[PDB]
Amino acid sequence: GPVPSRARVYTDVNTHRPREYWDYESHVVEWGNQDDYQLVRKLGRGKYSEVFEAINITNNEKVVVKILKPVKKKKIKREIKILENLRGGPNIITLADIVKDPVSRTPALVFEHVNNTDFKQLYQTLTDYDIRFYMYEILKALDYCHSMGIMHRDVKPHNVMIDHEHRKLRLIDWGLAEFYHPGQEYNVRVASRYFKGPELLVDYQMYDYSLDMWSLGCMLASMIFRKEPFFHGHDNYDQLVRIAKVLGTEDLYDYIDKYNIELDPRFNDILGRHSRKRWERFVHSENQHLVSPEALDFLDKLLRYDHQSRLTAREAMEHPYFYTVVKD
Ligand SMILES: COc1cc(/C=C/C(=O)O)ccc1O
Known part of the structure; x- marks a missing residue:
């Protein structure tokens, strides 16, 4: 069977809350x-x-x-x-x-x-500074809910309402959110296709807050590279193939091997062999003003196959990418 997994942070928040809470x-x-x-x-x-x-x-x-x-x-x-x-x-x-x-x-x-401008139009106008600012604001929400024992499980542009006039952001639609309990197996049919973490796509049920961090990384990639969505799969199988063409197949096999997970055999004919790519290949003259070494390192540390290897929300807020962002 699969190797068990635990969140590396806020692991026992709900364990020590009164029962009423969860x-x-x-x-x-x-x-x-x-x-x-x-x-x-x-x-x-x-x-x-x-x-x-x-x-x-x-x-x-x-x-x-x-x-x-x-x-x-x-x-x-x-x-x-x-x-x-x-x-x-x-x-x-x-x-x-x-x-x-x-x-x-x-x-x-x-x-x-929330007096929001919709994300297709908003994302077209966001500056480098705007992206860092709003990412930091999303991280505040994610660290808070994770620290409160809750994973959102549907992080995507549609659910991040932004009032650009007052530079105000709200994370909405908690209808897929769940309480994290160590060792609990969860439904993998959560999140929207383009934002589904590898754990969902390989049917690994013992996941945690770190799912939201993959989703956040997909958002970041779409914003700094001006490609929405970034991983544009035609279905849940093709979604994993699109991810593997970027992160590579050897690290995918390392992931599923670590947790003693088996891929759906239907991947035998569609997955192929792919090298890991460097993020610079996605940079071009129309997005380069949104890209920095800090952005790429931050992105790289969100988009890991292994959910245990991803930045936590708090770690992410410590990242040099946000040094430029004015703190309150
Ligand atoms: C569509 O605009 C809004 C949506 C919500 C909440 C949605 C949800 O929680 O599902 C809240 C404020 C809004 O201005």
Whole structure:
């Protein structure tokens, strides 16, 4: 069988929390008044929810309402409990209220409003300094939630809301987030394809916070190289092949050999043999102003096959890439 794995940090946070903290199935929801919120316009529909701009008529302020689609009560309670646990943490979206929607007959989560410019347009205008700044802000959120025993598991541009006017960032959609418990096996069908870590793609279930750090690395690569997404697979198998064409196949085999993991035999005909590449090959005249030796070293230390080898969020915040970023 597979070799077991543990997070190298925050390993036992939930072990030593009171049970109430991580036992979300027993959580009792405290409901607000649904009539406080007037829906204004639909912003989007995801796989698990519909999102609306709304007004809180008790203060005439903008809010966002997320009306959950029917899922098992645990996943609903999971997201709710995680949002309440993380509330007030750095760059964590603030859950303001929870109400029962009379039409959907499901919970509607009420969030602070973030006046966001969408990432396709925003990423086209970000300067070198902007990328470092916003990366540091994301790391604050990730170190916080990891330090609180929670992995996000769906880090991607869509879930990083940025108000570029006030240089404000919020990590959103905690609907796939989980509590980390040492030795627990998790569903590998998380994250969006382009941001899935090698551990998911080789079906290794005993993963941890470090999954988010791979996803963050995929984001960083897309931003500094101006290629979104960076690893552009046509499915989950091709996704691993695209990664292997960059990180190389020998280190992939070292990874799966370390954990005594077997590749899906369907890779026999598609994987090939690939050298590891140097990151400089992705630099060209239209992205070079976003690239520095510090950026490439930082990227290199996020994008490791071995989840145990990746920078932790805290380690990442110590990286020379962020020396240029003005600290508060
Ligand atoms: C789409 O704009 C927003 C979305 C959210 C939350 C989404 C989620 O948690 O799933 C919060 C504030 C927003 O301004």
